[PDB]
Write a protein that binds this ligand. Structure first.
Ligand SMILES: [Mg+2]
Ligand SMILES: [Mg+2]
Ligand SMILES: [Mg+2]
Ligand SMILES: [Mg+2]
Ligand SMILES: [Mg+2]
Ligand SMILES: [Mg+2]
Ligand SMILES: [Mg+2]
Ligand SMILES: [Mg+2]
Ligand SMILES: [Mg+2]
Ligand SMILES: [Mg+2]
Ligand SMILES: [Mg+2]
Ligand SMILES: [Mg+2]
Ligand SMILES: [Mg+2]
Ligand SMILES: [Mg+2]
Ligand SMILES: [Mg+2]
Ligand SMILES: [Mg+2]
Ligand SMILES: [Mg+2]
Ligand SMILES: [Mn+2]
Ligand SMILES: [Mn+2]
Ligand SMILES: [Mn+2]
Ligand SMILES: [Mn+2]
Ligand SMILES: [Mn+2]
Ligand SMILES: [Mn+2]
Ligand SMILES: [Mn+2]
Ligand SMILES: [Mn+2]
Ligand SMILES: [Mn+2]
Ligand SMILES: [Mn+2]
Ligand SMILES: [Mn+2]
Ligand SMILES: [Mn+2]
Ligand SMILES: [Mn+2]
Ligand SMILES: [Mn+2]
Ligand SMILES: [Mn+2]
Ligand SMILES: [Mn+2]
Ligand SMILES: [Mn+2]
Ligand SMILES: [Mn+2]
Ligand SMILES: [Mn+2]
Ligand SMILES: [Mn+2]
Ligand SMILES: [Mn+2]
Ligand SMILES: [Mn+2]
Ligand SMILES: [Mn+2]
Ligand SMILES: [Mn+2]
Ligand SMILES: [Mn+2]
Ligand SMILES: [Mn+2]
Ligand SMILES: [Mn+2]
Ligand SMILES: [Mn+2]
Ligand SMILES: [Mn+2]
Ligand SMILES: [Mn+2]
Ligand SMILES: [Mn+2]
Ligand SMILES: [Mn+2]
Ligand SMILES: [Mn+2]
Ligand SMILES: [Mn+2]
Ligand SMILES: [Mn+2]
Ligand SMILES: [Mn+2]
Ligand SMILES: [Mn+2]
Ligand SMILES: [Mn+2]
Ligand SMILES: [Mn+2]
Ligand SMILES: [Mn+2]
Ligand SMILES: [Mn+2]
Ligand SMILES: [Mn+2]
Ligand SMILES: [Mn+2]
Ligand SMILES: [Mn+2]
Ligand SMILES: [Mn+2]
Ligand SMILES: [Mn+2]
Ligand SMILES: [Mn+2]
Ligand SMILES: [Mn+2]
Ligand SMILES: [Mn+2]
Ligand SMILES: [Mn+2]
Ligand SMILES: [Mn+2]
Ligand SMILES: [Mn+2]
Ligand SMILES: [Mn+2]
Ligand SMILES: [Mn+2]
Ligand SMILES: [Mn+2]
Ligand SMILES: [Mn+2]
Ligand SMILES: [Mn+2]
Ligand SMILES: [Mn+2]
Ligand SMILES: [Mn+2]
Ligand SMILES: [Mn+2]
Ligand SMILES: [Mn+2]
Ligand SMILES: [Mn+2]
Ligand SMILES: [Mn+2]
Ligand SMILES: [Mn+2]
Ligand SMILES: [Mn+2]
Ligand SMILES: [Mn+2]
Ligand SMILES: [Mn+2]
Ligand SMILES: [Mn+2]
Lengths: 49, 145, 116, 43, 102, 112
RNA sequence: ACCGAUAGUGAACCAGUACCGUGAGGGAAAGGUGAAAAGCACCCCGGAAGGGGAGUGAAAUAGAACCUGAAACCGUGUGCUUACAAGUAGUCAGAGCCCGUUAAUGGGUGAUGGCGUGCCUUUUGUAGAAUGAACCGGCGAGUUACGAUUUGAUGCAAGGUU
RNA sequence: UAACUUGGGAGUCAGAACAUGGGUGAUAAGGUCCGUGUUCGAAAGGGAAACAGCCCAGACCACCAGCUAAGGUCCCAAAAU
RNA sequence: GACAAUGGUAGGAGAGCGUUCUAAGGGCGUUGAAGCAUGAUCGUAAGGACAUGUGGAGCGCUUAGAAGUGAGAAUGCCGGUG
């Protein structure tokens, strides 16, 4: 490669998904609704009731 | 939006016609006259302008009914004052100012719009057999239907 | 590296607001109001194209009905008569003939009364 | 009681159309060369 | 002396000598297209076809092969979170007629 | 050609000055000084001193005769407001805007 | 591969200061003329303020509250338009009048017709008389570190790795 | 023309009406609780004046082209005096 | 070339637009940068140019890297103005 013409190997490295950046992203509630999509987000680690 | 005709004020003409209400039922004579007034009879009809010709109604007094109209057909109206409703007339509006019984009965078939309001101004109803407007030189029109 | 918000936003809004050039009062200056008004404007536009098809068709129909009532004949009968005559002209055309050439239209009509 | 909606620009100015003041009724002082209100002193 | 050709999805009334527009014809600009589906013809003598008056082409030069004004297609659902914008420019063909029935 | 003068940051708030100018605007200059001298509002003496100045520049910097001069325009524009307050009931204090007016005026000849 | 005056220290300015509290304590705002001060001699209206000429300057339509100078908001001028009309304000259809472009099946306005109860949020369901927003601007919310797992990519491979 | 297996990621756990088989209620409820079907939710379009849940029918985009569905065809209002 | 499929909330998947910084390459700029304003401009969208006016000194483009990367709503915070 000539350095100003770098190319990452095909199939390596996809763009990270930024949630919460507008609606047509499909992610504007971010994810979930009204439960423990709360910021504590406590699934308790590994338990039911 | 390409190719269909639309009629201008530059490109339009309204004839005058006279009509003998005598022997005619209210509703039928009415709807036909409305069709005349709205211009839906010329093929140069176009909705957004008045393509309608003028109508003069004659011998209005002699208009017909059926059933128990004259008695059972109340014409209510309300004065926008409390208890101000006034039925105070039946089909016997024909007996007293039938020019209005006919005028309102036809006007009631024209649209609420200001255009269909201005087309209602092209009507001229008279209970008597002779009319003022001979100066416009109307042609007689036989009701079809 | 901190990224300032400059340009981009205000430009997006000036585009939106420019779309609202026709609008009354604040609908032509405030971004939000103009934005809502423009969205609704677009929805109206879409349905209104799909509508405008209808409106024009019904107009040609009524013109024809008029033109054939002139020849002592029902629109229903006129068109059924053409269809059984094998004539396949569109209504916009028939209204236009009825306005630009009375003779040819009458000729079509007498053609239509045949095969009945 | 408080307004339920804000007054429009166009509205507010339609209301203001009767808010001018009168051009004074003004006779010219003879020979003194100034000017003054009608039926007032010539100063 | 007008006449009626079935040319796009639809029918067209052309006075001969007249600029007209239609859906794209995939014909080279300046070359002369000849519409074969003629339905009717006006004037002093009036041929009126079944479908298609037999024979009788209408001829025209091709003028332009442009695309029309963009119209943005925007729509949305209220409250529920969705909207959709798409641009659109329908292609056309301007042609001017010469010698109807020729 | 057609001379002007301006009074920046006049203490009177613009709505008021506009009430006077609107009488003044467009009239012949002489008439205007009269009307100005006879109206009873604060803006009247202010606008007076301004129209006088404008006539001065017009005679002096442009050699035109004063008599044929006409008030081509006059107008007041928002100028920065001094911001104060008055104390009110129960310890709240509410704002007062003492706003100001820039008063321009322009006199005239013909097109040339 | 940190900030660039709402950022970065609370503090780029005589900041723990104005200001508040009895006190402990709490705690702001506020940077930019120009290359050079050359900071408008002089005349003019004015009590001054301010201003028009005359001038310095590349520029003062860079003049001190001074680079650029957006939007809200206030005004002057007007081309088209409006005083029989029931308006979520637009859209589709369309005369009339006026204009002339990033030249294209042009721009402004709009008599009249058809259609049409904003947006969020929350909801079984909101034109909703359920919630939020006076307007405009700036700022304002899935990050990083370290483990775990899985996918893709690459190097080797009964070996791989520090 | 699907199914199932295994692995990464989910949201959901307030439902509503109409038909229909039933329990509770009063063969009361725009009632409540279950079975079945559809539609809404998450579905615009046409019809039912208007009218999420009814009837017709599922909108990639453009047209001033035709046929039809429910429902309609004297005037408002397209089409049968 | 025919032939199909393309309503959609929670949500899954995919492909992209634009912001600032960096690397390298190739450029533009006092004969006028960015920014701001005006326009009938091009693209399927985010969005990209172009001319004129303003401004008076810094900017793009190509490829790849990395992000304090995108606002209309929080009785949001500060400023201005109704
Ligand atoms: Mg033509
Ligand atoms: Mg009483
Ligand atoms: Mg009488
Ligand atoms: Mg317009
Ligand atoms: Mg939009
Ligand atoms: Mg004072
Ligand atoms: Mg207090
Ligand atoms: Mg205390
Ligand atoms: Mg791994
Ligand atoms: Mg539960
Ligand atoms: Mg269910
Ligand atoms: Mg039951
Ligand atoms: Mg239940
Ligand atoms: Mg019937
Ligand atoms: Mg019969
Ligand atoms: Mg850019
Ligand atoms: Mg450039
Ligand atoms: Mn992505
Ligand atoms: Mn989604
Ligand atoms: Mn819930
Ligand atoms: Mn929520
Ligand atoms: Mn949940
Ligand atoms: Mn979460
Ligand atoms: Mn927390
Ligand atoms: Mn009583
Ligand atoms: Mn109607
Ligand atoms: Mn009404
Ligand atoms: Mn920076
Ligand atoms: Mn921002
Ligand atoms: Mn008949
Ligand atoms: Mn006023
Ligand atoms: Mn006190
Ligand atoms: Mn700054
Ligand atoms: Mn103290
Ligand atoms: Mn300096
Ligand atoms: Mn002096
Ligand atoms: Mn001085
Ligand atoms: Mn000089
Ligand atoms: Mn300032
Ligand atoms: Mn500088
Ligand atoms: Mn400045
Ligand atoms: Mn401005
Ligand atoms: Mn104006
Ligand atoms: Mn009027
Ligand atoms: Mn009246
Ligand atoms: Mn109503
Ligand atoms: Mn139009
Ligand atoms: Mn026009
Ligand atoms: Mn309506
Ligand atoms: Mn949102
Ligand atoms: Mn209300
Ligand atoms: Mn609540
Ligand atoms: Mn807010
Ligand atoms: Mn509120
Ligand atoms: Mn506030
Ligand atoms: Mn990382
Ligand atoms: Mn592998
Ligand atoms: Mn799974
Ligand atoms: Mn359960
Ligand atoms: Mn449940
Ligand atoms: Mn039951
Ligand atoms: Mn009983
Ligand atoms: Mn029940
Ligand atoms: Mn129930
Ligand atoms: Mn319930
Ligand atoms: Mn059920
Ligand atoms: Mn829901
Ligand atoms: Mn539906
Ligand atoms: Mn479904
Ligand atoms: Mn419906
Ligand atoms: Mn009903
Ligand atoms: Mn309906
Ligand atoms: Mn719905
Ligand atoms: Mn049919
Ligand atoms: Mn049927
Ligand atoms: Mn009809
Ligand atoms: Mn889809
Ligand atoms: Mn579909
Ligand atoms: Mn995803
Ligand atoms: Mn930059
Ligand atoms: Mn632009
Ligand atoms: Mn460049
Ligand atoms: Mn951010
Ligand atoms: Mn805001
Ligand atoms: Mn504030």
């Amino acid at each position: 490669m000539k350095l100003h013409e770098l190319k990452p190997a095909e199939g390596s490295r996809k763009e990270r998904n930024r949630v919460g950046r507008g609606v047509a992203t499909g992610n504007g509630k971010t994810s979930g609704r009204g439960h423990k999509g709360q910021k504590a987000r406590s699934g308790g680690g590994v338990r039911p009731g | 939006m390409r190719q269909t005709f639309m009629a201008n004020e530059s490109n339009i003409e309204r004839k005058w016609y006279v009509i003998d209400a005598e022997g005619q039922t209210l509703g039928r004579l009415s709807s036909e006259v409305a069709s005349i007034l709205r211009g839906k009879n010329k093929v140069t009809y176009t909705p957004h302008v008045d393509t309608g010709d003028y109508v003069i109604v004659i011998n209005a007094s002699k208009i017909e009914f059926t059933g128990n109209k004259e008695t059972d057909k109340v014409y209510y109206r309300h004065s926008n004052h409390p208890g101000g409703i006034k039925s105070i007339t039946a089909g016997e509006l024909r007996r007293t100012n039938p020019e209005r019984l006919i005028e309102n009965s036809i006007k009631g078939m024209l649209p609420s719009t200001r255009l269909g309001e201005k087309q209602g101004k092209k009507l001229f109803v008279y209970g008597g057999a002779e009319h003022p407007h001979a100066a416009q030189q109307p042609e007689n029109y036989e009701l079809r239907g | 590296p901190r990224v300032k918000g400059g340009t981009v936003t205000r430009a997006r809004r000036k585009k939106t607001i420019k779309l609202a050039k026709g609008y009354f009062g604040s609908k032509h200056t405030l971004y939000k109001v103009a934005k809502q008004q423009v969205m609704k404007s677009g929805q109206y536009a879409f349905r209104d194209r799909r509508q405008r098809k209808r409106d024009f068709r019904k107009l040609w129909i009524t013109r024809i009905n008029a033109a054939a009532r002139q020849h002592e004949m029902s629109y229903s009968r006129l068109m059924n008569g053409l269809k059984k005559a094998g004539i396949d002209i569109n209504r916009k055309m028939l209204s236009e003939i009825a306005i630009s050439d009375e003779k040819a239209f009458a000729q079509l009509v007498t053609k239509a009364k045949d095969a009945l | 009681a408080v307004p339920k909606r804000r007054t429009s620009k166009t509205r507010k100015n339609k209301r203001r159309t009767h808010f001018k003041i009168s051009v004074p009724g003004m006779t010219e002082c003879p020979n003194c060369g100034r000017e003054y209100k009608l039926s007032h002193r010539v100063c | 002396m007008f006449a009626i050709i079935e040319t796009g999805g639809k029918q067209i009334k052309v006075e001969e000598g007249q600029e007209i527009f239609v859906e794209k014809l995939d014909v080279n600009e300046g070359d002369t297209f000849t519409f074969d589906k003629v339905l009717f013809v006006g004037g002093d003598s009036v041929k009126v076809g079944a479908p298609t008056v037999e024979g009788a082409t209408v001829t025209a030069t091709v003028n332009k092969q442009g695309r029309g004004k963009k119209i943005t297609v925007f729509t949305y659902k209220r409250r529920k979170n969705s909207k959709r914008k798409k641009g659109h420019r329908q292609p056309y063909t301007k042609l001017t007629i010469d010698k109807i029935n020729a | 050609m057609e001379a002007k003068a301006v009074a920046r940051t006049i203490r009177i708030a613009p709505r008021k000055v506009r009430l006077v100018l609107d009488l003044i605007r467009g009239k012949n200059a002489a008439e205007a000084i009269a009307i100005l001298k006879l109206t009873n509002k604060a803006s009247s003496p202010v606008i007076e001193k301004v129209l006088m100045s404008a006539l001065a520049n017009a005679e002096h910097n442009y050699d035109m005769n004063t008599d044929e001069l006409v008030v081509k325009e006059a107008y007041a524009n928002e100028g920065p407001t001094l911001k104060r307050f008055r104390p009110r009931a129960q310890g709240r204090a509410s704002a007062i805007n003492k706003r100001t007016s820039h008063i321009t005026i322009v006199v005239s000849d013909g097109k040339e």
